[PDB]
């Protein structure tokens, strides 16, 4: 008798997804810049 024996996975897994938005909207913004320039 001598020995004895929430997390970040709920955030990072969404954080990259949020970063995914940052990797998707920006180009669409350029398309938006083209969209207002298309009419």
């Amino acid at each position: 008798r001598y020995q004895e024996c929430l997390t970040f996975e709920n955030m990072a897994g969404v954080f990259m997804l949020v970063a995914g938005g940052i990797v998707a909207g920006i180009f669409l913004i350029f398309i938006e810049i083209a969209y207002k320039r298309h009419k």
Binding site: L6, T7, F8, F15, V18, A19, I26, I29
Partner: protein
């Protein structure tokens, strides 16, 4: 053992040991990304 049970509560256990730092830094990262996106 009748004077007081003294049942442990949520605050009795350690709080904000290491997870809260991760949540805070991830919040700061998201805020910085949002500021950078709004800048453009």
């Amino acid at each position: 053992r009748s004077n007081g049970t003294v049942s442990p509560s949520a605050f009795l256990e350690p709080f904000s040991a290491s997870v809260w730092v991760m949540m805070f830094v991830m919040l700061l990262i998201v805020s910085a990304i949002a500021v950078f996106v709004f800048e453009y």
